[PDB]
Design an enzyme around this catalytic site. Structure first.
Site, mmCIF file in Angstrom:
data_model
loop_
_atom_site.group_PDB
_atom_site.id
_atom_site.type_symbol
_atom_site.label_atom_id
_atom_site.label_comp_id
_atom_site.label_asym_id
_atom_site.label_seq_id
_atom_site.Cartn_x
_atom_site.Cartn_y
_atom_site.Cartn_z
ATOM 1 C CB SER A 140 -1.029 -0.016 1.256
ATOM 2 O OG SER A 140 -2.227 0.862 1.089
ATOM 3 C CD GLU A 186 -5.132 -4.251 -3.452
ATOM 4 O OE1 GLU A 186 -5.302 -3.910 -2.204
ATOM 5 O OE2 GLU A 186 -4.217 -5.055 -3.823
ATOM 6 C CG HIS A 208 -5.549 -2.521 0.810
ATOM 7 N ND1 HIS A 208 -4.832 -2.490 -0.240
ATOM 8 C CD2 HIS A 208 -5.218 -1.390 1.377
ATOM 9 C CE1 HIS A 208 -4.257 -1.248 -0.294
ATOM 10 N NE2 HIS A 208 -4.249 -0.779 0.721
#
Ligand SMILES: c1ccc2c(NCCCCCCCCSc3c4c(nc5ccccc35)CCCC4)c3c(nc2c1)CCCC3
Ligand SMILES: c1ccc2c(NCCCCCCCCSc3c4c(nc5ccccc35)CCCC4)c3c(nc2c1)CCCC3
Ligand SMILES: *[C@@H]1O[C@H](CO)[C@@H](O[C@@H]2O[C@H](CO)[C@@H](O)[C@H](O)[C@H]2NC(C)=O)[C@H](O)[C@H]1NC(C)=O
Ligand SMILES: *[C@@H]1O[C@H](CO)[C@@H](O)[C@H](O)[C@H]1NC(C)=O
Ligand SMILES: *[C@@H]1O[C@H](CO)[C@@H](O)[C@H](O)[C@H]1NC(C)=O
Ligand SMILES: *[C@H]1O[C@H](CO)[C@@H](O)[C@H](O)[C@H]1NC(C)=O
Ligand SMILES: *[C@H]1O[C@H](CO)[C@@H](O)[C@H](O)[C@H]1NC(C)=O
Lengths: 532, 532
Positions: B197, B324, B437
Site C-alpha cells: 500500500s 483492494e 487490501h
C-alpha cells in the site's frame, strides 16, 4: 365484374393474378395525385383530378426518379432493391391486392417502402402483396412517394419547395385509402400502416404528425423509427443542402425563387448525379434529402413531441434485425468486401468509427471505440468487423428504435416488440453480413411460401407465423390469436420491457433489448457531445 | 557474542528469539536518526549521533504518533493494524532479524509499512520478520518513518516544514542499512526494498527519486505504486492543507514561520484530532498528508519521469489483491456494514461513486457509473456492492499499478507481476469483502507456518511458496528457482504482459490484467475530465 371498381375518383379495372394455386384481384398503378412534374416539382402534391371512363390498373406504374445501385451488376442481392420499372417523375401511384371473392369490410394494410428517403419502389418482387393478401385475407395496399431532392429538397419559407412533400405524398395516398378502400372491400376504420427502414421511420412520422394521425388505425415499424439520426434534418441544414445542390449545378443562388427555378429546369438525372455531394460529413448511413423538422408537419422537435405524448395513441408492433449495419459498411467503409470475410484491422476499425459517428469529436470517438473494443484481444479481425457492424446498427437503427418504443409505450395503448435474427438459407450475401437490414421483409411478404424460391420448410413456417402475427395485429391490435394454444407474444411494458426473437426456433421471451449499448447511445454519448 | 554487533554508530545488543522450533537473532529498536522532536518537528531527519556503550536492542521501539482505529473495538481484523506499542514522536528506529549462525554476506530485505501515509507501525505481529528471515535465510529489516502531518506537512519554500520528510526518514534508514548491514551479515549490494500500500507507493518513490536510487538493489511493490491518486499532492494543495490545519487549531496564519511555530507547540494528539478536516472533498481513499511533488525529492511530475525513463532501472516484482477496495467502502461509504452482506441499493451505489472519484464532474461520474453497471440487472444489490468494490480497487490501486508497470517495463531490467486472489480460511472479516487490501501480507511474512494461527496446509504451502518467490527474487532478481521442476513465473513484457495468480491452486498464467477497466481509468476518464 369483380375486377371493376367504382371509386370516388373514377372507375378502375384490375387483373386476376395467380397465387399459390389460386387467384386474387390486383389493381396496379392507381393514381392518387396529379403528376408532380414541371413547375410542380418540389411542390406539395395535389389530389388526382377525377377521370372519366375506366382506368386500366392491370400493370405496375413507373418508379420515382432515383439513384440506381450498380455496385454489383447482375447480383440479385442488390438488384432486388433497384427500380424494376421505368423511372419517371410521374410516379405517384398505389397498388391494391384484393382477396377473391371481394371482401365486404376487411382489415387493410398499407405498405410504405424504405430506401433511405433517396430510393425505393412499391413494385419490387419482394413487396408483392398477393401472398399476404391471399393468405391472411386482407386488402394489401402499397403506396409510393417522391424520394431524393424530388421528395425532400427543403427551403423553409418558400411554398415552391417547402420540404417534406414526399411525406405528404404518403399522406395523400393514405387519404385516398381512407376515402376509397371501402369500394375494394376494405374497412377504412381498420387500416394498419407498415414499412421498413425509411418506411418504418415514415410510419413513425405519421404517428407524430397531427395532420396524418386520423388517417390510420394502427402501425408497424420495421428496422426504423422517426427519431433515427439519418431520418431528418433541421430547416437550416435542409436549406444549406438545397443551396449546395444548386451550387453543384451552377445555379443562380441569389434567391429561393432563383434556385428553385434553376433546379426545375434540370433533368431528373442531373439532380441525381450530384445528390450525394451535399452531405456535410464523410459518413455512412446518412442521406442527403430527408424529412425536415419544419414546425408544420412536425409541430416541434421530435424529442419534445415524444416527451409530451404529442402523438397518436394506439397500438404498435415494431422490431429490428440482428445485423442492421452490415450493408452500409460493405458499401462505404474501408476493409469491407462482398467476397471476403472482411476481417478488419485496428486501423480500419478506427476509420469505420469515424464514418459511423460523423457528428462526434475526438472524445466522442474514443468513447465509442472503448465501448466496442475487447482490449484483451484488440487485433482480432472478426471482433473488429462485428464490432463495427454493431456500432452502425446500434447507433442508426436499434437504439433509436428502443428510445422511441420506451417513449411511446408510456402513452400508447399496446406495444409488441421483436428481434429478427434468422439468417435465410438461400441468402446470397456473404456470411459475415449476418441477418441483414431489410431481409425480414421477404418473410413478412411470404416469399418462403413459394417453392421455386427454395427456402426451407422451417422458413416457410416462420413466414406464415410472421404473416399471421402482422395481420392479426392489424386486425385486432394484438398479434396473438385469441384462445390460441401457441406461445404468446407478450406486450412490451415500460416496466418489464419484454420482446421476442423471431426465428425458426421455439419462441423465447427476453427483456431490455440491447440495453447496455443503448444507454450509451441514448444517454451517455449525447451528454458527452453536449458538454464537450 | 552472536548478539553483539559493532556498527559505525555504536555497539548494539540483540536478543535470541524462538521461531518454528529454532532460534535467530533480533536487534529491535535500533535508532537511525535523531528524535524528530521539539523544533525538529516537521524537519528533515538528522542522522543519529554515534553513541558510546552498548545499545539495548532487545525490545520493540515506540510507534510514531498516529490516528488510532476504534471502529471495531477489540475486533482483531482492525486491531492488528493499530499501534501495538506506545506512541511517541521519538519513533525513528529500525528492526533486524538475523539468521543464526550469523551470515557472512547474505540477501537483505527492507520492509516499508503502509497505512495511507497517516498511520503504520514496524512492530505489528503481521510484520514479524523472524519467519521470513529464518525460512529463507535473509537479513530482514523493517524501518519506520513519520506519518500524518508529522511526516508530510508541506509548506514548500520553507526549510522548517519542506514536506516529504517521512520519505526522507525512509531514505535515512536505507542509508543506515547500506552503511551498517554488513556487520549483521548482510550484503549491502543486494538489498531489496519492499512494502505494501503506501509502503508500496514509497518503494516506487525511491525508485523514482535520484537521491534514493543508489541505496538499494531491487524492489517489490505490493498493492501500491508511486502514481496512485492518493499517494501525492501538488505543492499548492500541500500548502493549502497545511494552512487549513493551522486554521483548525486557531493558528496565526500570517507567515509560514508563524504557522510552523504554532503547529510545533501543539501536542501530538491535537494535530491528529483535526487531521482529517483538511481534505478538499467528501471522499474515500484520500489521505490528508502525503508526499508532495516538490521538484526536489521528485525532480518533475511523476508521469513525465515515467515517460522519460527518469528512474532507477533494475528488476521489480509487484502485484495486487482481488478486492483492494472493500475496506474503505466499509469504513466510509453508506450502506456498507461489517455484519451484513452489504447489498447496495442503486442510490447508495451512486453515493459510492461520488465518494470514489471525488475529483470528477457529472459527465465523469456518469462515465464511471455506466462502466460498472449491468443495465440488464441494475437493482441487484450484490452486483452494485461488487461494482463499487471494483471501482475503488481499480481506480485507487490496480489501474495505477498497471500504468506504472507498463511504463517501467519499457526501461526496466525485469518485471514479475502477480494477482493475489486467495481468501484466507481464518479470515475474520465478512465474506463480501473478499480478498482484502493488506491480507497478502500475512502470507509474505509466513504466518501460516504457525499452527496456532490455524491456517490450512494448503495455505502454509502457499506462504512458503510466496516467501521463497520473494526471497529468491531479492537474491537474484528472478523469483524462479534456477533449474527447478516447478511451474515458472514468467517475466512480464510490454508485449505479452503476462502475470500469474497467487493462490492455493496450480499456478496459472494470464495476460493484460484488468485491461478493459484500466484503459478506462488510465486513458479515457482522464481525457474526459481534461476536455470537460
Ligand atoms: C431497404 C431498402 C434498400 C435496401 C438496400 N438498398 C441499397 C442500399 C445501398 C446503401 C449504401 C449507399 C449507396 C449509395 S452512395 C451514393 C453515392 C453517390 N450518389 C448517391 C446518390 C443517392 C444515394 C446514394 C448515393 C455518388 C458518389 C458515390 C456514392 C440494400 C439492403 N437493404 C435495403 C433495405 C441490404 C444490402 C443491399 C442494399
Ligand atoms: C495496510 C495498512 C492498514 C490497513 C488497515 N488499516 C485501517 C484502515 C482504515 C481506512 C479508513 C479510514 C479510517 C480513518 S478516517 C479518519 C477520520 C478522522 N480522522 C482521521 C485521521 C487520520 C486518518 C483517518 C481519519 C476524524 C473524522 C472521522 C474520520 C486496514 C486494512 N488493511 C490495511 C493495509 C484492511 C481492513 C481493516 C483496516
Ligand atoms: C538486464 O540487463 C542485462 C545486462 O545489463 C541483459 O543481459 C544482456 O543482454 C544482452 C542482449 O540480450 C547481451 O548482449 C548481453 O551479453 C547480456 N549481458 C549479460 C551480463 O547477461 C538482460 O537481458 C537484461 N534483462 C532484461 C529482462 O531486460
Ligand atoms: C391496359 O389495359 C389493356 C386492356 O384495356 C391491356 O392492353 C393491358 O392490360 C394494359 N396495357 C398494356 C401495358 O398492355
Ligand atoms: C534492555 O536491556 C536490559 C538488559 O541490559 C533488559 O532489562 C531488557 O532486555 C531491556 N529493558 C527492558 C525494557 O526490560
Ligand atoms: C433454387 O433452385 C435451384 C437449386 O435447387 C437453384 O439453381 C436456383 O437458383 C434456386 N432458385 C432461385 C430462386 O434462385
Ligand atoms: C484457532 O484455534 C481455535 C479453533 O481450533 C480457535 O478458537 C482460535 O481462536 C484460533 N486461533 C486463533 C489465532 O485465533
Amino acid at each position: 365484374s369483380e375486377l371493376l371498381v367504382n371509386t370516388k375518383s373514377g372507375k378502375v379495372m384490375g387483373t386476376r393474378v395467380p397465387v399459390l394455386s389460386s387467384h386474387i384481384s390486383a389493381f396496379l398503378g392507381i393514381p392518387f395525385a396529379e403528376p408532380p412534374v414541371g413547375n410542380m416539382r418540389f411542390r406539395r402534391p395535389e389530389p388526382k383530378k377525377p377521370w372519366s371512363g375506366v382506368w386500366n390498373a392491370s400493370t405496375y406504374p413507373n418508379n420515382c426518379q432515383q439513384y440506381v445501385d450498380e455496385q454489383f451488376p447482375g447480383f440479385s442481392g442488390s438488384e432486388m432493391w433497384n427500380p424494376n420499372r421505368e423511372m419517371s417523375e410521374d410516379c405517384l401511384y398505389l397498388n391494391i391486392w384484393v382477396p377473391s371473392p371481394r371482401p365486404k369490410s376487411t382489415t387493410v394494410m398499407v405498405w410504405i417502402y424504405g430506401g433511405g428517403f433517396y430510393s425505393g419502389s412499391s413494385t419490387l418482387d419482394v413487396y408483392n402483396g398477393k401472398y399476404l393478401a391471399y393468405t391472411e385475407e386482407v386488402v394489401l395496399v402499397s403506396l409510393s412517394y417522391r424520394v431524393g431532392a424530388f421528395g425532400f429538397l427543403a427551403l423553409h419559407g418558400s411554398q415552391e419547395a417547402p420540404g417534406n412533400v414526399g411525406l405528404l405524398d404518403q399522406r395523400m395516398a393514405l387519404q385516398w385509402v381512407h376515402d376509397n378502400i371501402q369500394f375494394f372491400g376494405g374497412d377504412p376504420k381498420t387500416v394498419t400502416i407498415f414499412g421498413e427502414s425509411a418506411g418504418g421511420a415514415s410510419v413513425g412520422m405519421h404517428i407524430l404528425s397531427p395532420g396524418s394521425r386520423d388517417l390510420f388505425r394502427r402501425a408497424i415499424l420495421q428496422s426504423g423509427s422517426p427519431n433515427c439520426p439519418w431520418a431528418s434534418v433541421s430547416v437550416a441544414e435542409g436549406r444549406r443542402r438545397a443551396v449546395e445542390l444548386g451550387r453543384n449545378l451552377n445555379c443562380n443562388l441569389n434567391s429561393d425563387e432563383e434556385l428553385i427555378h434553376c433546379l426545375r429546369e434540370k433533368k431528373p438525372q442531373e439532380l441525381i448525379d450530384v445528390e450525394w455531394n451535399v452531405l456535410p460529413f464523410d459518413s455512412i448511413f446518412r442521406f442527403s434529402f430527408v424529412p425536415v423538422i419544419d414546425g408544420e408537419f412536425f409541430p416541434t422537435s421530435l424529442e419534445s413531441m415524444l416527451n409530451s405524448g404529442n402523438f397518436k395513441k394506439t397500438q404498435i408492433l415494431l422490431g429490428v434485425n440482428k445485423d442492421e449495419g452490415s450493408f452500409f459498411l460493405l458499401y462505404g467503409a474501408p476493409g469491407f468486401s462482398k467476397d471476403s470475410e472482411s476481417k478488419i484491422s485496428r486501423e480500419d476499425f478506427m476509420s469505420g468509427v469515424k464514418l459511423s459517428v460523423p457528428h462526434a469529436n475526438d472524445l466522442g470517438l474514443d468513447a465509442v471505440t472503448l465501448q466496442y473494443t475487447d482490449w484483451m484481444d484488440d487485433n482480432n479481425g472478426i471482433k473488429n468487423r462485428d464490432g463495427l457492424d454493431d456500432i452502425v446498427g446500434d447507433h442508426n437503427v436499434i437504439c433509436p428504435l428502443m428510445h422511441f418504443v420506451n417513449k411511446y409505450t408510456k402513452f400508447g395503448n399496446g406495444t409488441y416488440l421483436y428481434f429478427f435474427n434468422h439468417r435465410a438459407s438461400n441468402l446470397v450475401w456473404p456470411e459475415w453480413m449476418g441477418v441483414i437490414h431489410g431481409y425480414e421483409i421477404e418473410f413478412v411478404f411470404g416469399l418462403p411460401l413459394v417453392k421455386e424460391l427454395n427456402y426451407t420448410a422451417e422458413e416457410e413456417a416462420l413466414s406464415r407465423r410472421i404473416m399471421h402475427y402482422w395481420a392479426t395485429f392489424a386486425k385486432t391490435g394484438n398479434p396473438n390469436e385469441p384462445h390460441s394454444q401457441e406461445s404468446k407474444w407478450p406486450l412490451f411494458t415500460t416496466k418489464e420491457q419484454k420482446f421476442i426473437d423471431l426465428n425458426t426456433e421455439p419462441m423465447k421471451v427476453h427483456q431490455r433489448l440491447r440495453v447496455q449499448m443503448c444507454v450509451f447511445w441514448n444517454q451517455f454519448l449525447p451528454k458527452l457531445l453536449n458538454a464537450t
